[PDB]
Write a protein that binds this ligand. Structure first.
Ligand SMILES: Nc1ncnc2c1ncn2[C@@H]1O[C@H](COP(=O)(O)OP(=O)(O)O)[C@@H](O)[C@H]1O
Ligand SMILES: Nc1ncnc2c1ncn2[C@@H]1O[C@H](COP(=O)(O)OP(=O)(O)O)[C@@H](O)[C@H]1O
Ligand SMILES: C[C@H](N)[C@@H](CCCCCC(=O)O)NC(=O)O
Ligand SMILES: C[C@H](N)[C@@H](CCCCCC(=O)O)NC(=O)O
Ligand SMILES: [Ca+2]
Ligand SMILES: [Ca+2]
Lengths: 224, 224
């Protein structure tokens, strides 16, 4: 299977919206797709247990019919850092379980997108961060950049750190979290010059419900 | 002179509020102080030229009576990245001018705090970032962390990058940009464990005008 990890310059920059666009483009290319969010925090109660909205977005944008727990094995109700609520609840986030879940999806899918939680260094325990697991698995990384004042600094910090870990930065996606602003073109040119990987596409500001929108057309999958 | 550079996990995290607290503590320790913001964007028109509010905060919190241009040689009206507006206006930001200004302050002050613009990697031209100048000058670095969801990742990214440049991270300051939230203690414990430098103090949420507030008491200067 082709496998990619998606990270962001921060929490709430559109990692989930961009992952749905990537999944839609891959399905259009003919792949059997699966989205995987191994850890999620910020979830609602239902008859079946807790359900996270970002994991549900990945489940319904995958081409295969997948069970919720296969897409998201670790679901926490409170929207905070996973290591805090894991410790509070007495439910360890185990590296072996996260890796087993990825293998289980590779039995049915040939294109798997793994979405992180928060940015690059989100702690999963007191001695283990999400970056440690990505390094262990040697996953190529796609960076989602929310375009806003302050994003050049956060895009360059994340790019340098991935490269120093010896991982491949496969590309980046620009996501327009706000309406058209005055220096949008100049920000796009600087980010293109400075991030050492191809720009895969730009998702526009979409007021109504951008997880459900047909956004695959904004990604050029040939660059991955 | 003692010289320190202050950076932040992002723009608008309280770098200026924390710099005024540091300057107030240094004056209380008996130093002849000077604040220096060599580049500033986001400024008002006056009879005397453009004036930036953060540079004015540093000027009035310094113990010496200083002229505005000595505190801030490069003033731009628009609140954007300095390299965009520098190019637009035809006014180059020169490394030699920024360094000369620092030397000029060292003639009168024995404790100088240099405040950056934005975060670590803010571009000053198409081939030069603020980090390049800090490295050239070999300044020790103080990191200001705005405590909010997403700050663990941004604090760890900035810490790693400074250390890989061979610079010293002298310490960090926690700044409470919002009211007391549910996981404040746990965030403080994680940040203390993960940032490899001493916590110099914590500035509380101060609704009214925290640049003018007496905040020196929140910094323990003995750790610097
Ligand atoms: N392109 C966009 N247009 C409009 N709103 C967006 C866009 N991208 C993200 N948003 C909104 O920003 C919020 C965070 O997006 P999300 O993908 O969940 O972020 P993340 O996975 O990085 O935490 C959501 O409410 C989402 O609808
Ligand atoms: N501790 C605080 N309490 C209340 N407001 C704060 C605090 N720190 C920062 N702010 C507010 O946040 C905004 C940004 O602060 P500022 O120091 O100018 O940031 P920066 O130098 O990082 O760009 C200002 O409006 C400021 O009043
Ligand atoms: C306007 C802001 N306050 C700040 C500049 C932020 C530049 C952000 C660059 C980036 O996108 O990383 N300017 C300043 O500190 O004077
Ligand atoms: C609640 C957020 N959306 C996110 C967790 C953010 C953790 C932030 C850690 C940090 O401070 O860097 N969870 C998630 O992606 O499922
Ligand atoms: Ca979300
Ligand atoms: Ca300010």
């Amino acid at each position: 299977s082709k496998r990619y990890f998606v990270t962001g310059t921060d929490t709430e920059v559109g990692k989930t919206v961009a992952s749905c666009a990537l999944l839609q483009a891959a399905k259009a290319a003919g792949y059997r797709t699966a989205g995987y969010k191994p850890v999620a925090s910020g979830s609602e109660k239902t008859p079946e247990g807790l359900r996270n909205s970002d994991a549900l977005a990945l489940q319904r944008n995958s081409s295969l019919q997948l069970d919720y727990a296969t897409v998201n094995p670790y679901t926490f109700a409170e929207p905070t850092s996973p290591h805090i609520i894991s410790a509070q609840e007495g439910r360890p986030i185990e590296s072996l379980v996260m890796s087993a879940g990825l293998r289980a999806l590779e039995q049915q899918a040939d294109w798997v997108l793994v979405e992180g939680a928060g940015g690059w260094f989100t702690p999963l325990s007191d001695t283990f961060t999400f970056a440690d697991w990505v390094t262990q698995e040697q996953l190529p990384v796609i960076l989602v950049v929310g375009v806003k004042l302050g994003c050049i600094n956060h895009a360059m910090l994340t790019a340098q750190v991935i490269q120093h870990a010896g991982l491949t930065l496969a590309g980046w996606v620009a996501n327009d979290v706000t309406p058209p602003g005055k220096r949008h073109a100049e920000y796009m040119t600087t980010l293109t010059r400075m991030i050492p990987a191809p720009l895969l596409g730009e998702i526009p500001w979409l007021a109504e419900n951008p997880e459900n929108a047909a956004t695959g057309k904004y990604i050029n999958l040939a660059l991955l």
